[PDB]
């Protein structure tokens, strides 16, 4: 299996009400392992997975100082972008930032990310060659010329191709009992009359990890798109995931339809029929 | 592990 580490940062201004709200979360794959909340009591990077708690105080002290510096830089960013867009000093605005790395099944570097959004719009993004930038409008072009002149991409690449994958591999080993696990979907099919001549078949996948999954409907062996619906994969809240797919079928024809679930935890794709 | 190096927009 391939793997990823992602850090997500949200900074939301609140003029007159103190410094911006800053929330940072860190993920390996679909497992959250750290968070920071500028408004929480601890004022520390906090563990969110069992395998990260084995890191000593040096690790937590250092991540706390870094994440607090992150918050202060993104607080300056809110001020800067306000000027770029000639926006009023009064309103609330949102800076989002994401960075991280993917590795392949050999745990060697696959790709890296470093990108920003302002008020939900793309702002600036490191391109896949990790050497160039996509600026979404004319304020972001200002950032891009500055970052080109400061050779920012070169320093990001040192992290994305190096440090980021080295620590990702550390977490994959230290957390192997949960990060390298696959929980196979528990599956079942429900059925509901929907009109006087139609019924909804719902194919359920429960309790699976990781979140990647494929649920398909077939009629007489042929994949079916007409009258089907996919719900967004959702968290159960215990570290596994849930998802369903439904199709509306003529009543009396339930048995020509099959649901098909593929998931890394399944040695062979499952086939369910009403 | 967080990236330490920070650059302002």
């Amino acid at each position: 299996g391939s793997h990823s580490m992602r850090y997500f940062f949200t900074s939301v201004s609140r003029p007159g009400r103190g410094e911006p709200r800053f929330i940072a979360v860190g993920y390996v794959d679909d497992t959250q392992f750290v968070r920071f909340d500028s408004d929480a009591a601890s004022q520390r990077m906090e563990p969110r997975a069992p395998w990260i708690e084995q890191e000593g105080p040096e690790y937590w002290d250092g991540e706390t100082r870094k994440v607090k510096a992150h918050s202060q830089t993104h607080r300056v960013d809110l001020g800067t972008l306000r000027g770029y867009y000639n926006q009023s000093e009064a309103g609330s605005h949102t800076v989002q930032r994401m960075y991280g790395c993917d590795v392949g099944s050999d745990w060697r570097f696959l790709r890296g990310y470093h990108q920003y959004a302002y008020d939900g719009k793309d702002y600036i993004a490191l391109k896949e060659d990790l050497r160039s930038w996509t600026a979404a409008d004319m304020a972001a072009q200002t950032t891009k010329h500055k970052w080109e002149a400061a050779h920012v991409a070169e320093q990001l690449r040192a992290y994305l191709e190096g440090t980021c994958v080295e620590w990702l591999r550390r977490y994959l080993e230290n957390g192997k009992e949960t990060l390298q696990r696959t929980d196979a979907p528990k599956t079942h099919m429900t059925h509901h009359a929907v009109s006087d001549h139609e019924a909804t078949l719902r194919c359920w996948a429960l309790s699976f990890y990781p979140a990647e999954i494929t649920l398909t409907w077939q009629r007489d062996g042929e994949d079916q798109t007409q009258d089907t619906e996919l719900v967004e994969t959702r968290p159960a809240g215990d570290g596994t995931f849930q998802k369903w797919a439904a199709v509306v079928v003529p009543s009396g024809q339930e048995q020509r339809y099959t649901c098909h679930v593929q998931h890394e935890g399944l040695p062979k794709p499952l086939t369910l029929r009403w | 592990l967080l990236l330490d190096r920070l650059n302002q927009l």
Partner: T-cell receptor
Amino acid sequence: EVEQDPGPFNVPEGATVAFNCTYSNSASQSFFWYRQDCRKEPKLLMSVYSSGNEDGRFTAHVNRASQYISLLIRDSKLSDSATYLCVQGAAGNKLTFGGGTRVLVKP
Amino acid sequence: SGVTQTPKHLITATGQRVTLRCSPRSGDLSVYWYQQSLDQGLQFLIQYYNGEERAKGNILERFSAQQFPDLHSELNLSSLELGDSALYFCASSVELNSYEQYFGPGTRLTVLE
């Protein structure tokens, strides 16, 4: 957290000299070499953010596994005689300086 | 202009006070004070950004600093001791959180009995 070899390294003119500096915190990921002439201010020589960096007759290399930083100076000139400071960045905002390595290039 | 500092040299007696002045690089909003001594090398004292104290090293109570609206900085040392003899370096950077710190030429302070 930054320990380097004080020297003085006596280098025949035109020879190659290299010295190490070690860092304690494995999470550290940004380092630099600075040059400082006697009683003057420290000046950036070269940054090292990844496994290594080569800038001209100078070559620096971060052994992230070994947790040490190296500098190498090829074809040493008398003008290279100086103190070389091993420098670690922390948290994105703080520089920590080693005590310095003195090199004396002999004519 | 680059980073400038005044005076270049100060000779004073124990118990006195002095003021060190720094004008950062034009365009720089951060100013940092560093102390270089024979016994502990180069040590970070304090950083201002746009007039506000922002990061603190192991600066003593009897040391105090300031960045003014024109972004120049003043480092005041009081109840001077022999041990305060050192090279005091101003540095500046464009941004709040930066490793790209450009050092001034230093003020040398000697405190004699």
